Amino acid sequence: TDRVVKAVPFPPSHRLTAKEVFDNDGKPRVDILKAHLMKEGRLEESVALRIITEGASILRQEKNLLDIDAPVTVCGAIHGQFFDLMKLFEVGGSPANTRYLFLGDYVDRGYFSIECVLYLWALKILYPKTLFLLRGNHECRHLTEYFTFKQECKIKYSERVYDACMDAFDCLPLAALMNQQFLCVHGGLSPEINTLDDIRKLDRFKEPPAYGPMCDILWSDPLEDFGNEKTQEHFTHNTVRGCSYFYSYPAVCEFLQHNNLLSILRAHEAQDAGYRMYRKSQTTGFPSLITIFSAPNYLDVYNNKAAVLKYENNVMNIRQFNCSPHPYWLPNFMDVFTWSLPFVGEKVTEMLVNVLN
């Protein structure tokens, strides 16, 4: 009876129970989940931990290098944009009848990362053979405690949910082999990965180290002049990231030609049009490198389009989409009492300072 603005929806306080989310066969009801999560509605902590654990069990069974066949939708970095994730599934096709391959980076940046994790983990449980989730550089314990994802779990839910995600991200596969043609990673190649068996030999169930091929899978980036190189140095130090390497056009072409592949799908880097097809390989005729970015209007300032890749019927359909309205949040999930209390303490002090003189 004391609410000035009614133009925004009042978020619900009823935490979804285990009976409202899960059916009688242990299948999560994604319809109740989407409708509740989009209203900024929270789940019961026991349910939030149940969706993470049952999903991580399916992820722990999967291999380091997944076998995915066409038709399949290839998504890029989401970065906690849950209300843009809802438009991504409408552009790329409903998950109930379309294969999906995500390339990581589901958390951090966007202030709806836990909503993205709970919804993508619920689709992974409901579709354990048609939907696939790979790991990015942000699905670790070092970046989430630095990029407000730990704060997102502690404010919306509890620190126990954050601990469950750090154990669920360790189960995310590293790479994927799509249709025996394309290698799908997050960052890119590595100076320690010559064959696809080098991808299989890695122990992904750990925190991504600062070295080794596991770090280069998620952190490496293409050269700024990819395709127009000054030298032939295959891997140089990635000076922007501070770790991993820069892979060149001769490096990717040699890798594509050695393992008899066509291209390398990846994300990890923002694109103004949501995608970027790099220089064609002289021995294939197809773009040797393809960056995919599924975050429209990155950080609410980039004003960029986001693209998804729907590979079907020998056609690589890069389908773009724009952003969607999302609720507002103060930086680092700060409440209005913490934000305004210093201003209250300061300006009131200035009053008596000048009143009493």
Cis ω for the linkage preceding 12 (within 30 of 0): no
List C-alpha distances in Å: 77 to 47, 137, 308, 315. Answer: 26, 10, 10, 22
Q: Name the phi and psi angles at 310, rounded to 5.
A: -110, 100
Residue 338's binding partner among other proteins, Fe ion, none (Cβ under 5 to 8 angstroms by kind) is: other proteins
Residue 141's binding partner among other proteins, Fe ion, none (Cβ under 5 to 8 angstroms by kind) is: none
Shortest approach of other proteins to residue 133 CB, angstroms? 19
| Candidates 36, 138, 186, 268; catalytic one | 138
| 87, 124, 150, 268: residue in contact with Fe ion (rule CB under 5 A) | 268
259 binds other proteins, rule: CB under 8 A: no
Q: Where are the beta strands (DSSP E) in 98-217?
A: 100-102, 131-133, 175-178, 182-184
Q: Given the rule CB under 8 A, which of 30-38, 125-133, 229-237, 320-328 is the region that contacts other proteins?
A: 320-328
DSSP category for residue 9: P
Q: Which of 6, 24, 16 is nearest to 43 (CA)?
A: 16
Of 91-110, binders to Fe ion (CB under 5 A) are 105
Q: Given the rule CB under 8 A, which of 118-126, 170-178, 196-204, 299-307 is the region that contacts other proteins?
A: 299-307
Which residue, 201 or 237, has its beta carbon nearer to other proteins?
Answer: 237
142 as an active site residue: the answer is no
Q: Decide if 284 contacts 256 (C-beta within 8 A).
A: yes
Which residue, 149 or 321, has its beta carbon nearer to other proteins?
Answer: 321
Which residue, 105 or 216, has its beta carbon nearer to Fe ion?
Answer: 105
Binding-site size, other proteins (CB under 8 A): 78
Q: Given the rule CB under 8 A, which of 48-56, 199-207, 247-255, 341-349 is the region that contacts other proteins?
A: 341-349
Of 118-177, binders to other proteins (CB under 8 A) are 137, 142-143, 146-147, 155-156
Please report the DSSP string for 20-43 in residue order.
HHB-TTS-B-HHHHHHHHHTT--B
In whole angstroms, give the CA distance from residue 148 to residue 107.
9
Which residue, 23 or 272, has its beta carbon nearer to other proteins?
Answer: 272
- Residue at token pair 């070295």: 211
Shortest approach of other proteins to residue 213 CB, angstroms? 18
Q: What is the largest CA-CA distance in the chain?
A: 83
Sheet strand arrangement including 221-222: 221-222, 245-247, 235-237
Token readout for 62 is: 């999967």
Which residue, 84 or 105, has its beta carbon nearer to Fe ion?
Answer: 105
Q: Looking at the annotation, which residues are catalytic?
A: 138
Positions in the binding site for Fe ion (CB under 5 A)? 105, 136-137, 268
